[PDB]
Amino acid sequence: EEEASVSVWDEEEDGATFTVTSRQYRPLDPLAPLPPPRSSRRLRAGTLEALVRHLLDARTAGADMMFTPALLATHRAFTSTPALFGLVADRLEALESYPPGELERTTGVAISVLSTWLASHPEDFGSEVKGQLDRLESFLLRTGYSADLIRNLRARDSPADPTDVLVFLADHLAEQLTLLDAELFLNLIPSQCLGGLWLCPSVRATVTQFNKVAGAVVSSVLGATSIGEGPREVTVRPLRPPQRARLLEKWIRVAEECRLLRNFSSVYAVVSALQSSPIHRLRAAWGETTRDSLRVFSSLCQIFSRELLTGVVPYLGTFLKDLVMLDAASKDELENGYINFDKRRKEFAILSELLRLQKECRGYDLRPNSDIQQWLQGLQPLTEAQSHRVSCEVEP
Template sequence: MASILQAWLDQCADDFREPPEYVCLQKVLSYLKKNMPGSDPEKRAQNLLEQFQKEEWENDDAFHSLSPCTPDEEEELEISGPEEFSLSQEDLVAEQLTYMDATLFQNVVPHHCLGCIWSRRDKKENKQLAQSIRATTSQFNAVTNCVLSTILESKELKTQPRAKILEKWIRIGRQCRILNNFSSLKAIVSALQSTSVYRRKKTRACVPKDTMLMFEELCEIFSDCDNFATSRELLLKGVTQGTVPYLGTFLTDLVMLDTALQDYLEGGLINFEKRRREFEVIAQIKLLQSSCNSYCVTGDEKFVQWFRRQRH
């Protein structure tokens, strides 16, 4: 038992990453304290628990503990309205979105993506299930809402300035593509393809043709042709450098696998083909999580404050 638990804790630590309570890890630790006090597995389990709690605290501090801006502080922010946003640097915005996305993606617990877990998230008793994946989903929605609010919120904004903001987001999307941040890129593309933006024909007509061609190229990345072959190919090419995927593709794959294949075959035998195919997807997620260590971007508090203030 000591050898098995030591190997599990060392080689598959992410299996125990279940914030905020870490129930499975607490059970293992309790068992070790009772049956193997002072052993190496007990020390490893205790260190792992402290490590996870520290990482959770650091992430909360980075993203959720920012104090609301006072009116004076709002004036100090570099981006305060639609027109100021149109003058902001595309690479700065793309880098900050990538920083947030990469941090959240690295904290995703891979096995929570399995269809048997994620497909049951909406049940009343599962409100605390797969919190790390819910965080990435919330971030995706926040980026989409940020795009929509900057383009549409101001009713007094004239066509030309509004077109400048639309153009700005396309160029930010292009920067996200350069950074291999497919999560924010997908969110930006989805927002710009929405009915509320698409129906503003005069605004789109004011955007330069070369920028609109750029937008069409970005849209092609997420074409559903041949089971999203283009985006999957780009992900495989990007594993040697920092890459943040659109997690929805993996979640869809795993839910479909869970729906299509049974857990057990005739006679109660485990369906190893299903487990093998699920493992292939999970392994890709883990590989991409490791690639995020290649990013050398730090958070900008002013940008995060501005981003969090955007209305839905």
């Protein structure tokens, strides 16, 4: 595992730039002849056509292992699914005159790539790729070549009292918030998180629920129910500072139980709601909060979290921000018109983190509590304008 030499150089092809790396390691037996050097030839930038040539090259899987999954995961940021499918069908068609050995090899790579693509991202394929599908299966029958791949590609009543948070146990509430957060995080299409895209419903649905939880906290602490849409249309229940503190203490504990379940999405939803202007203002209510609940809350505030992500539900906003930073920092294309694939590798790196958090999220074993769920559904959260108004009314 101890290396002796590393050589790095760049090579140019038709419409692409590659980086070759050659690493010479010392043999395990120090007296043995030198082992063969370990190498990689990775595409750095190239035309959309050149990306597809590299995609369907049999050597790419061994010499550039990030390329295939990165391209398949990020392609919707710079091209489209029917466009990429079409260029794959293009490449295969321009290869029909080739000798049977080369034809069968590349067709095999194409079948392998399309199977991985379909397995990884089934939502990419629909009615829009109909012509490209016919383009593919006519090519296969024409060359006499995959059967399962074609088949698989063919197939594709009054508003709830917000203060009733007190009626349920805090660990149960956390478990129930996590159940909703987890299934949304599992249904998340990671590519929709990309700076170039974020038409992104799976991200929107995660953010909506995040906002509903944060809204529920603000609403219940203020003891208010949003009955209309305007800044003035609200109903408010009577709460003395000691009574309101019990609601603050309750949500603090719910946030704490979310943390123990590693649901950092709802931890942040609750903590940001409690740090929010219309809730921070409530100094009489906070003044009645027990010191133990305050120390827990401060500890929860200092988390916002990246180091703790090593069941689980992450706060998606941090990944959305990193992907916005990266999109702003890195160019889509180079001056020559080549797609800057380095950008896409850095994007995939973040996406693979999300993928590994998704498989860990599958580890949850939680049961739907019908009555907590019904309460959550009946919640009518206050708008930013309404909450500011009510807080000015309940604590002048």
